[PDB]
Amino acid sequence: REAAVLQKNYLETQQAQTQAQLAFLQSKFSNAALYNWLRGRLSAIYYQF
Amino acid sequence: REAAVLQKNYLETQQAQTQAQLAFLQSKFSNAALYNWLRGRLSAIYYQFYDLAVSLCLMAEQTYQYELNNAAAHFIKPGAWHGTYAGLLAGETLMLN
Amino acid sequence: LENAKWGVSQLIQFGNTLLSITERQDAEALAEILQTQGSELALQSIKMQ
Amino acid sequence: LTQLISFLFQCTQWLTTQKWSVSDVFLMTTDNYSTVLTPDIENLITTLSNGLSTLSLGDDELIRAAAPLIAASIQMDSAKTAETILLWINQIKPQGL
Amino acid sequence: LTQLISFLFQCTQWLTTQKWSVSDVFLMTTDNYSTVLTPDIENLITTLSNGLSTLSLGDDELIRAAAPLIAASIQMDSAKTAETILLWINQIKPQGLTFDDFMIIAANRDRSENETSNMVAFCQVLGQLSLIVRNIGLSENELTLLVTKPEKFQSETTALQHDLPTLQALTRFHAVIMRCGSYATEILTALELGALTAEQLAVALKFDAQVVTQALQQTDLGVNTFTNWRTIDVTLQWLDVAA
Amino acid sequence: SADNTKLDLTPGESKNHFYLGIMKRAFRVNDTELYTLWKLANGGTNPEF
């Protein structure tokens, strides 16, 4: 039983680390929002060019 | 029991190898610190170069407005250094102008 | 116009290089944080064994 | 009464089929939204002001000009999706705009 | 005595919630740091000397010039974070040094032992601020608000301190803002102004408008809006007890 | 007892705690949630209970 409780604590640690990775993907500067803005602005400039 | 002891030794070996990988990521030359210094230094140089190139574009605009006798020909749009995206594509906007 | 096109081409090169540098920086920090939490999970797994 | 009961039941069924919450549908369908000046709205303002050229002609040309900048600002993937969303909001006119 | 016991208990609880150690908080909050000339400090000196141009004008222009070089040197990600950390350290002044007169102690290579000790203390306070930002998680729209207007943090503060209660309240502030989720930037920019009311915080935290405004009327009898963070925190404490 | 006794369901102006607690326990509800339950029943208004 104590081994299974330690296993559940391991799974909670895995959930917290996956949340930390998701927060890093949100909070990085080179996220999807920067690339979305880049492709929209560059499509406009590309068409006028 | 001896099989489980060998399994614990295997897990200790995995911990030591993950520590070795972490030490390699710290001790490599192309770590995160080099890229942090590169992006800070390059952001500074990029902003000052933005100042110089928009001054050159204003020079060319003044030249065009003097040659073609028209003082209203404003071709360089105000902006193009969007600080929230750290001023990327400024060269694209200036090439367009 | 030739001088201005020179300066603006150099600025295009610098913006492309800055983009490449910041995305390499983000990938490197991601790999570092992954190795740290993998080390912590390895410690917890030994404690379970 | 039974029409309301059937509506609430099938709406809850469609909600739990789509794996959304009542807060999610309230976000996508509310009308009591805020009036505060969000930084995303400020970025939309400065992008749609600076990146846009001279003032264009209606849904025929101004929409096709401003759809890449709007798809840049609010995170959509296609300028065609942004264009038809602009037609959607032009035939809806929130608060007269 | 019971105040000290309660303080130690809640500090240990916040510590083990944040998964830090006493050594980690001592690193982020100490004042007995070294005076030795670290190679990182030497790299900061030579970067901030060579990469910087002619001597600029104060926090208005010299800070905006030197923030990319400082974010290059001590490993921060945003020049805006480096700029607001420079404002943070300019309103704090470790050992009398502002951000100016650290540049003048730098770029000399002929300095007193007190001069290099002061520059080392300045760089170590900068490193402590880098750790105190990247450990708690702050994308500067929460941070530069508390730096520029510390009234919005607490109405009695007027100078954001380097202390453990300020760190703990920063933690709970960041926790509430990250619990707001999709409305987090709207809550932040509504606290930027004085327009943050109920039916916005209750929406962002999935509460009821009347329960939230009853707790807000309980903590402040006539303040209709949320004008501060401390009222938000005690409002959520009232909501936690009532729940 | 279902008497025709008026009770304003706004959460501060009742002072008749017997029927209020009986309704809150029978409907498993709070004061505010009871008030908005009565407001939903009359289209956002509270005429008279």
Q: Indicate the SS3 state at residue C49.
A: coil
Q: How far is the C-alpha of E144 from the C-alpha of E83, rounded, in Å?
A: 9
Q: Are C7 and B88 inside 8 Å of each other by CB?
A: no
DSSP secondary structure of B20-81: HHHHHHHHSTTSHHHHHHHHHHHHHHHHHHHHHHHHHHHHHHHHHHHHTT-TT---S-S---
Report chain F's terminal Cα–Cα distance, integer Å. Answer: 15
Instruction: Determine how many CB atoms are found less than 10 A away from the CB of residue D77.
Output: 12
Nearest-CA neighbor of E164 among E2, E63, E1, E20?
A: E20
Q: Are E77 and B86 inside 8 Å of each other by CB?
A: no
Which residue of A lies nearest to C35 if distances are taken between CA atoms?
Answer: A17
Within 13 A of D85's CA, how many CA atoms are on the CB side? 14
Strand ranges (DSSP E) for D3-95?
Answer: none
Nearest-CA neighbor of E177 among D30, E169, E160?
A: E169
Q: How far is the C-alpha of E103 from the C-alpha of E119, rounded, in Å?
A: 9
Residues from chain E contacting residue A23 (CB–CB below 8 Å)? 137
Q: How far is the C-alpha of E38 from the C-alpha of E123, rounded, in Å?
A: 10
- Technique behind this structure? cryo-EM
Instruction: Determine how many CB atoms are found less than 10 A away from the CB of residue A30.
Output: 18
| Cβ–Cβ under 8 Å, residues B94 and B54 | yes
Q: Are E75 and B38 inside 8 Å of each other by CB?
A: no
Question: Tokens 């520029």 label which residue?
Answer: E148
Residues from chain F contacting residue E208 (CB–CB below 8 Å)? 32-33, 36
Q: Which structure tokens are listed for E50?
A: 């060579």
Candidates E51, E65, E75; nearest CB to B36: E75
Q: How far is the C-alpha of E233 from the C-alpha of E187, rounded, in Å?
A: 14
D29 to chain B, closest Cα gap in Å: 29
Instruction: Determine how many CB atoms are found less than 10 A away from the CB of residue E1.
Output: 5
